[PDB]
Structure formats: structure tokens, C-alpha cells
Amino acid sequence: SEFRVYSSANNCTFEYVSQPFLKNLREFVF
Amino acid sequence: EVFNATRFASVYAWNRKRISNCVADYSVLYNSASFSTFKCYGVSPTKL
Numbered sequence: 598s599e600f601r602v603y604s605s606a607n608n609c610t611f612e613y614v615s616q617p618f619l620k621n622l623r624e625f626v627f
Numbered sequence: 628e629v630f631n632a633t634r635f636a637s638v639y640a641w642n643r644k645r646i647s648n649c650v651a652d653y654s655v656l657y658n659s660a661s662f663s664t665f666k667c668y669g670v671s672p673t674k675l
């Protein structure tokens with residue numbers, strides 16, 4: 598309900614936005 | 628967002644802004660008459 602682990606980000610170099618990913622089986626390959 | 632800023636910083640502490648993942652059309656700023664000087668080193672301003 599709050600934010601975490603991605604705190605104190607000195608500087609950040611990349612951002613991209615897409616449409617959302619997620620009785621339903623969800624397969625991914627990386 | 629870079630050329631129009633409410634206040635510019637002093638030269639003792641210049642800003643360094645990162646520009647990435649975009650298409651840069653330099654013809655609008657190059658054609659714009661609002662600039663007093665436009666000096667390019669290395670390559671000519673029209674092939675960029």
C-alpha cells in the first residue's frame with residue numbers, strides 16, 4: 598500500500614511505458 | 628523544457644541535463660531567429 602526498495606535513486610537513465618501485462622496461466626521468457 | 632526555464636543557474640554551478648530516447652529536430656531551433664549566435668565546431672549545422 599506504500600512504496601519500497603526503489604528508494605534513494607541518485608539518478609536514473611531510462612523510462613518506457615507500455616500497456617499492462619497481468620484461471621489464467623501466464624508464461625514469460627526472458 | 629530546456630530552452631524555456633523560469634530561472635537559469637549561475638555559471639559557477641552549471642546544469643548538466645541528460646537527453647535520451649527521442650528524435651531531435653534541430654531545424655526548428657536553427658531556423659528560429661531568436662538566437663543571437665549559433666557557432667558549431669566539428670560539423671556544419673545543416674547535416675545534423
Ligand SMILES: *[C@@H]1O[C@H](CO)[C@@H](O)[C@H](O)[C@H]1NC(C)=O
Nearest residue numbers: 606607608609610611643645
Ligand atoms: C549518475 O551519475 C553517475 C556519476 O557519478 C554516473 O556514473 C551514472 O552513469 C549516472 N546515471 C546513473 C543511472 O547512475
